[PDB]
């Protein structure tokens, strides 16, 4: 059972989706990437962006740029291990995209443009069964993090589903353990240092609606929001207006830390929370939840995929000496990589369910 | 009698232009500018990126940002020294801008997107006498750079005129010295080390026309090309095949290095020549071609509103021992910067010349 | 009467203590800067540093390189403005330097070598009558943060005088006025994002104190200590204990922002908090405490001399919506020029009150 | 039959050299590394500078860190692989090194600061029998590029031995396949748009030497010298007084690229000269250079081996179009890592040749 997947936005995180598909062994056997969408049609220059990024590398799999057929004038088909994959053109409205006709049961979301329920339901108007938005969703739409709350998806009512941000899904698995260990938050702040991204300017320019945002980007600490000031409540309704925090966006292309302040519910320490936090990274969490004991800094986090990485020695020494209830928590995440991964095991989780009940 | 400018693209070099006829002393006697155009109509939003600029600060003027009538909603006038400039909407084609009707006669089009004499003329049938393009032009408009051809200007024919690039305005008052005082240059090969632009992207993402320009833009040295290259043979034809070159977008905001290999066309000297380029920066070059003796860096050349300014130094220390035909001649320039402060003279010298004629 | 200084390590802060000095209008008239000690005694070199500043342009003053004696090789003294400073050759030991001989009384230790007192009393042996190290100090002496506890300097007792970090110069404001408006803290943990400095390396290399921080600095988030740690006590006495914090090290080369996360003494508001700042803003911390209601990233902040300038939009947007007890103040800072007029304006408060007891 | 090899600065290059000896398969088998040797002992801090490298990634091989006895204090043994590494204790003269004690042949001087050939021979007193210098030398020591003229090595007069610089690298192998196919160069003029190295500075501060190079590295474009001004001149003698070069260092913190204008001894086309070096590239050039096809930028060469790998699309874009003579040819490199594979090749090479005489 080939799960067939469309890809709709192939950037950042649509190509890092498909590489965590090939990298991880599903192409063609597991999940069938059926069809990927951008706005051009030109499988060489999708070639020549899938061989070569500037902070993952060169990929593993190989990759070809063929024609359908001669009577085309420009490639159209990418053959990724033996698999093809076709480059459908890039629609306006979701509804206009030929998932149906292309036999596309599962459609990842990445453009960025339809992270409203109602607006990426017109997957699913064009013959999608089911939609996993890559980002916060709006309008109604299920968000789930792998690691704390993918269970409560269910076949029947859930269509389009959200995996939240890459700041979430850093953030709450650290919330998850806190509450279900039992050290529990009374109220946290948040602060996530993070890399700029595609939505930031290389020089000041236009930005109505974050004016800090359009600020040259490499060469300004810009204040901002995050996404998972909302969504951690989301997932876990326990933290809803008990958390929110804000977002620096500092000069690196990838990798952001999370640096949560929160106040316990019982007194504790924070060597009780870092044990926790290690055992639950080694048991219940292990694969979303990491840690480390070194010094690292940022750059030793490309390509890391656990959804959030606790740094062990920059909390333990960035706390007050003798507290039972104010803590910091340090924790590092690829924004680009872990979340790639997390939509992949979310289109699979998914599919196993959809097919576990119908 | 104020000269009637509006400015179309309100982007780092609509903005710069303008800035440029505040800090000479035209705006409101010499210059008026009716209208700036841009995404947006919000003059908050204009006062913010004309009052805080990553790159060249706070400027010296001051702005406020008042509502035309009480009528309106958002702040639609910009107030710069007690002077009202109107926020005109965005328009997908030039013919469709007010200019005849808000008075406008020159117009400075610095949008990007028209580039083409043709969609450029749009302006005049929009109620535009002339239309200056902050950029070079394709479909046949006439291209000066100033101090080299700005004679060359006929208030008769020159009706779409093109200012060339910031490289070509650091390229020509070099290749102009070097023709006008004999050395002369046989072939020549030029390397223009570059800022990024906003035409480039934070991270890795789609630039179908250079591909490599679509690469994170701070983080890589990414080749491409330099319009210097087709220009310098417009403004001079003496160079017509006799000179090309290219650029490497490096990881810097603002200012930009020219790096000229030539051989002469009679056995000279590379003090023969350092000692002409001198001497036309001091007599008729002055305020284009500039110089410096020291040991100075990028940093130092943010807000030299010369067009080319001569590094005797670099020039000096790197050419070969007793060389009579092959030299390096090594030129900076604020990209932003001096090119603003060119159009504005080019403004100025066309509504001059048009007034002493017709 | 002018106040005799030397200047022992001209870097960033010994070149920005030098300009506050010129710049506030002190050189020759108020403050008499006998000497400039560092690696070098060629006053060209040393002129070369005054006059281009890659983050904070050239100068107001003028620098000239003079010879002493002809008989010299290179020129050894700076004119700076027509007055005439000693360029003294750098002593691996504070105590062999001629300070009684050339007539100086207050020294500037900013080396950053001979932070322990002891390494610092080193050159009142010498010569100098007071001593104000640009850094944290331990063996015990007395750490003042301009407006906050300077009344606590006695000329008796204090000669070796700390003016704290930064990062203390921006964080003990803010705490300062919560203690005096009483919403007092009880707890709190605190980040800068803070600008790579001198002590960083350009690609990785070694640093064996702290291992994260031979990191590539301008490429890496880089999680570490900060100096406001132990300061923020030492000044403010009823945070001992209460109140830690940690470092990001991101990538630009000045200015930074302090993230204070506290719980209250109090039920109170961030409406509250943010008026009770603006308000000490505006009257008691006029001049060290400042505030904007703007939309700024780190850029803005080049050349502001404030010590904490707190941003009123990205605290109150990014704090929980109806919290009586935890908030987050967001507050910024240029490390390198606010700090260094601090400097200049310790000495200036000091040695009054030294000419006013003895 | 081990080569027994020791390297003295365990830096940038000492740490690629070492990856570069276990990638290529040869630790513990083909080359046994008796020490390195930096200012520390500190077993653990160098495995922490050998697993988290910023630019090239973990290594593949495995890192541990003993104590030789149980008396040391510190963990001051490296066990890569099985194979045992000592933590040699930094010296002031090379001489003080006790290699014949440790059983040492060949030693690596990768610290910057023994670049003469008698302070090099240094370490032949101090009990080594060969040096290689990763770094162009003074004081006549004998200069080889590998691919181009390592068969100029006699085991029997060259001791201490200089592998030239990261540029020659790049550079000599083009100018070699030039010369070599009959094409020549007359004279030729290079720039190299260069990564910064740790030799810069992160802010403005000292360099007596160059006054440039001590401006903030990730800020500037930095114009400098090269050390293929001198060296390739050296390696190809035929190139002594015909070719000379400048650097421009950009805020990349690893990779480069070679910019070269030269003027051909005979009529030719860019196509020939096209042909010539890809055909190079896959006969006698073969592992030392390469070519690409593709729209690469710097990023893409993090990690390539090739001492300089040609741009084929660079290239044939960017030249004068019916041209016969003067040229530009653009080749990348990663300035850390290919260079420091050709210090082992080098090492390998010699090493036979010794033991082939003696
Ligand atoms: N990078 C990270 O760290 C990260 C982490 C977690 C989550 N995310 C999230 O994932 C999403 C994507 O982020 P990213 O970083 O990959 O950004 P990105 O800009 O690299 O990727 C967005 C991609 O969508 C494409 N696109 C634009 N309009 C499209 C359209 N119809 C419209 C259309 C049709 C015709 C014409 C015009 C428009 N149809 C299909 N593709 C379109 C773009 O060309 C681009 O390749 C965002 O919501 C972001 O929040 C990013
Ligand atoms: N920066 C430099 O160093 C430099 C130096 C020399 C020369 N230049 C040249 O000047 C030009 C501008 O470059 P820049 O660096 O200022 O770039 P920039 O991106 O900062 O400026 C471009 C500006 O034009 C605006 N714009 C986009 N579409 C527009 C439109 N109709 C279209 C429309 C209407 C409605 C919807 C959609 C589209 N009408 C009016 N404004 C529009 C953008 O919002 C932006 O503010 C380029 O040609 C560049 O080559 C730059
Ligand atoms: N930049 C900021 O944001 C900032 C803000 C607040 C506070 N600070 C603090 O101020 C201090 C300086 O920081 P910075 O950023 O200016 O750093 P910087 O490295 O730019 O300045 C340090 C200066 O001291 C010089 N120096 C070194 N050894 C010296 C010596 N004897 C020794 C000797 C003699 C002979 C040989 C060898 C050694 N005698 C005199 N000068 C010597 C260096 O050449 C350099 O110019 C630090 O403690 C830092 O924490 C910095
Ligand atoms: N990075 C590149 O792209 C590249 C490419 C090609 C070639 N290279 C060349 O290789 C050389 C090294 O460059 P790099 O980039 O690796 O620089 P780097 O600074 O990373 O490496 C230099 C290493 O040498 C160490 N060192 C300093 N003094 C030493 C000493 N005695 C002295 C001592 C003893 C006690 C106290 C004080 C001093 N003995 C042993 N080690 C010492 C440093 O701690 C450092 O680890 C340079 O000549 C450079 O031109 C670099």
């Not at 709006?138 to 859930?158: C, D, F, L, R, W």
């Amino acid at each position: 059972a080939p799960i067939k997947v469309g890809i709709n936005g192939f950037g950042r995180i649509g190509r890092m989706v498909f590489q965590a598909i090939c990298d991880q062994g599903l192409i063609g056997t597991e999940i069938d990437v059926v069809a990927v969408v951008d706005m051009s049609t030109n499988a060489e220059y999708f070639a020549y962006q899938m061989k070569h990024d500037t902070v993952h590398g060169r990929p593993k799999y190989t990759v070809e740029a063929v024609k359908s057929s001669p009577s085309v004038e420009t490639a159209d088909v990418l053959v990724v291990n033996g698999h093809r994959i076709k480059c459908v053109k890039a629609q306006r409205n979701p509804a206009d995209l030929p998932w149906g006709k292309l036999g596309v049961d599962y459609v990842i979301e990445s453009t960025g443009l339809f992270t409203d329920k109602l607006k990426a339901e017109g997957h699913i108007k064009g013959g999608a069964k089911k939609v996993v938005i890559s980002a916060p969703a709006s309008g109604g739409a299920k968000t789930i993090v792998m690691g704390v709350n993918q269970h409560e998806y269910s076949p029947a009512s859930h269509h389009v589903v959200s995996n939240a941000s890459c700041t979430t899904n850093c953030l709450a698995p650290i919330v998850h353990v806190l509450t279900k260990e039992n050290f529990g938050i009374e109220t946290g702040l948040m602060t996530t240092i993070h890399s700029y991204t595609a939505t930031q300017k290389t020089v000041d320019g236009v930005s109505l609606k974050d004016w800090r945002g359009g600020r040259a980007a490499a060469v300004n600490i810009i204040p901002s929001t995050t996404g998972a000031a909302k969504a951690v409540g989301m997932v876990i309704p326990s933290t809803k207006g008990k958390l929110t925090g804000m977002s620096f966006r500092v000069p690196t292309p990838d990798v952001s830390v999370v640096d949560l302040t929160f106040r316990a519910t019982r007194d504790t320490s924070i060597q009780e929370i870092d044990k926790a936090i290690k055992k639950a990274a080694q048991t219940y969490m292990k694969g979303i939840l990491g840690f480390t004991d070194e010094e690292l800094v940022s750059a030793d986090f490309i390509n890391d995929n656990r959804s959030s990485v606790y740094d062990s020695k920059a909390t333990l020494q960035n706390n007050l000496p003798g507290e039972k209830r104010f803590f910091k928590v340090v924790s590092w995440y690829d924004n680009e990589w872990a979340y790639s991964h997390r939509v992949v095991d979310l289109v699979r989780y998914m599919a196993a369910k959809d097919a576990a009940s119908s």
